Amino acid sequence: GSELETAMETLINVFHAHSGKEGDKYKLSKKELKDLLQTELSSFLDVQKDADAVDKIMKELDENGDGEVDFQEFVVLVAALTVACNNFFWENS
Amino acid sequence: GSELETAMETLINVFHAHSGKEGDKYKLSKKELKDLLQTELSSFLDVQKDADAVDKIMKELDENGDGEVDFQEFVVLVAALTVACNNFFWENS
Ligand SMILES: [Ca+2]
Ligand SMILES: [Ca+2]
Ligand SMILES: [Ca+2]
Ligand SMILES: [Ca+2]
């Protein structure tokens, strides 16, 4: 099946849906990623309600203080945090 | 939309489709991950043709030499490698 493959194609499409909407299509930005999580992962990855949560999240990515992200840094950080949350409910049954 | 959200639900379902098929449903294994990539990401992440490629890939994950993976280690390693490949074709246009 393409279920797992479809997983890579989908995050890449929404990624180019908002990332290229700001014009900076060659680099991601702090506001661009804010839209992607609050759009489909708002309930899981809290972010829209805690705007401070997005400043902290980009800080690990923008460790360079570039206020911009290379998108690759983003996938590794949120990938581990959300995956851990699913096991959190399963751990207590 | 749930396109990005659907991305997390799909890799998690196939993950529990083969991971729980070996009985070791509490921990992933070297053969379990081999099936997930060769099943839907065979063409992108070469693996089935280069069985040596799977030994090397788990080595970074099983840096502990446990021949077993915590699944979380897996998502971060293959997440960055496949994402980079998509930009490889885009970089040369
Ligand atoms: Ca962008
Ligand atoms: Ca950055
Ligand atoms: Ca398993
Ligand atoms: Ca491991």
Angle at B35 between CA B34 and CA B39, to 5 degrees: 120
**In DSSP terms, which residues pair with B83 in a beta bridge?**
none
What CA–CA distance (Å, rounded) separates B14 from B20? 10
Residue B69 near residue B35 (C-beta atoms within 8 A): no
Residues of B in contact with A2 (CB under 8 A): 40
Residue A2 near residue B40 (C-beta atoms within 8 A): yes
Closest chain B C-alpha to A64 CA, distance in angstroms: 19
What CA–CA distance (Å, rounded) separates A70 from A68? 7
What CA–CA distance (Å, rounded) separates B29 from A91? 19
For residue A4 the two structure tokens come to 């797992």
CB contact under 8 A, B8 and A39: no
B75 touches chain A (CB under 8 A): yes
CA closest to A71 among chain B residues: B83
Chain A 15-34, residues with CB within 8 Å of chain B CB atoms: none
DSSP assignments along A15-65, one per residue: HHHHGGGSS--SSEEHHHHHHHHHHHSTTTS--SS-HHHHHHHHHHHTTT-
Longest dimension (CA), chain B: 45
Chain A 29-68, residues with CB within 8 Å of chain B CB atoms: 36, 39-41, 44
Residue B19 near residue B71 (C-beta atoms within 8 A): yes
CB contact under 8 A, B2 and A83: no
B69 touches chain A (CB under 8 A): no
> What domains can you pick out in chain B, each with its CATH number?
1-93 (1.10.238.10)
Measured in Å, residue B36 CA sits from the centre of ligand 2 at 30
